[PDB]
């Protein structure tokens, strides 16, 4: 809630996308609880 800075974001469809399917980017959809601010979760366990 006390973040200070610029959240820079731009479109990168011409770089991080491929017609055959660019599946190298993943995202965590299920989790036991809510994530704390500035926290990383790389575990591949099955929820």
């Amino acid at each position, epitope marked *: 809630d006390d973040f200070t800075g610029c959240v820079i974001a731009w479109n990168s469809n011409k770089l991080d996308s491929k*017609p*055959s399917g660019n599946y190298n980017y993943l995202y965590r959809l299920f989790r036991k609880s809510k994530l704390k601010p500035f926290e990383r979760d790389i575990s591949t366990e099955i929820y």
Partner: antibody
Amino acid sequence: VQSGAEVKKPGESLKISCKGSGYTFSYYWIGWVRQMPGKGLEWMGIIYPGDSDTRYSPSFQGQVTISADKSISTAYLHWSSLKASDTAMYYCARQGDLGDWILLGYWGQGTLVTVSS
Amino acid sequence: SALTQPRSVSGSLGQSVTISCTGISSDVGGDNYVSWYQQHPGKAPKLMIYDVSKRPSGVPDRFSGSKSGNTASLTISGLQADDEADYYCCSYALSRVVFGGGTMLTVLG
């Protein structure tokens, strides 16, 4: 198959070409890499089939421009005020679904431009 | 930075050869931005080794690579007569394509 290399003098604005096949010229990056006799490959820049967001090498910002044709899927290059050290084997490469956008999946045939007087 | 490669190597039929590749940079996002290209003398170059953590399609299994800090190596086994070609390592971590100093693969017999 590529066009022949005619003997030209520095300052005549010659042109080279390359013909590729086996893909769709819609969203795959494509560029040109030269090779001078006695040295390795030298990457100049690439071009996008849509918005031509061309990113040239720092040593090729104002030395060569990309003028590839999209309607015929044939790449082309344009020069202006050439020099004697411009003789190199230009190879046409594309993005390909093998690696990332900058990775070169396939390559062309290559034509060695000869400059003499 | 400029990639440093041996000018000429001396292999042998049936043996192995390791081509060195130094000067590889890295950016935020990964450090496996290493790719090798196979260019026959007077012929068209062909992509041989890229993403050494994986295996390309159509390339024989006798080609592999490794990573150790800023120095990479190309492990090639089963040297034959038709394997005589030029090899160059590439680094594209900073969205810039760079090549080595040129390598000439020679075999004995």
